[PDB]
Amino acid sequence: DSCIQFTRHASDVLLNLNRLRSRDILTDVVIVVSREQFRAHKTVLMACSGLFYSIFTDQLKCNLSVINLDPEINPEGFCILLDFMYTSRLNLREGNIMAVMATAMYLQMEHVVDTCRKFIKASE
Amino acid sequence: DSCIQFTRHASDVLLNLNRLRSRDILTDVVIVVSREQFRAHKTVLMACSGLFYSIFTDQLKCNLSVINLDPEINPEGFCILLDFMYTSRLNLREGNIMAVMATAMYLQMEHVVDTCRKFIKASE
């Protein structure tokens, strides 16, 4: 087509979606990761994660307001990944990289799994 | 912080939100623009438009599944702006620029109003 494109649009949209999350506006699901609870927007979770895409396209699960993750999932790892979904920034540290990579494999977030594998390889 | 950032994340999120819209997945509102109907995600509309942000933060309107726009709004202008919200690309043409600018002023989409004003000024 002959469209023009606003370079910062996608980043500005994501910033506004994170402001809605901050302010608990139109959040429609609670993700439970053992004793912790995380409120989020189903559409953002589906857009970032192959696991959430499969969950919320299921004719029965699409209607659930609470999703319980596998008990082996680390809440801090999930929190770091949820923040990445809404900001593009990943708080990857020596002390959390194994939990973050395991969580990203479970959530099916291929680009995160890729950077974790590279950072681990560099330390070996 | 010491975060790393994935450059294409925001664009990839928006692409996936547009794929959900295409496929009518988790759309939660119908915007009516006279005889036409447009299905969308409230969160994407709020993230892009000052008018939708005000509508869906209202304690009564946040619960509506149908929103009727002012009868003066042009459906094609709205369609072009809805596509811009989900893609960052604006189909601005000599034949639609006046309707697009009027719609963007109503929806409170300042960057679109800005490029329309510039394109109009260049033709004068």
Binding site: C3, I4, Q5, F6, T7 | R89, L90, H111, T115
Partner: peptide, 4 residues
């Protein structure tokens, strides 16, 4: 704004 750019030409994509």
């Amino acid at each position: 704004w750019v030409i994509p």
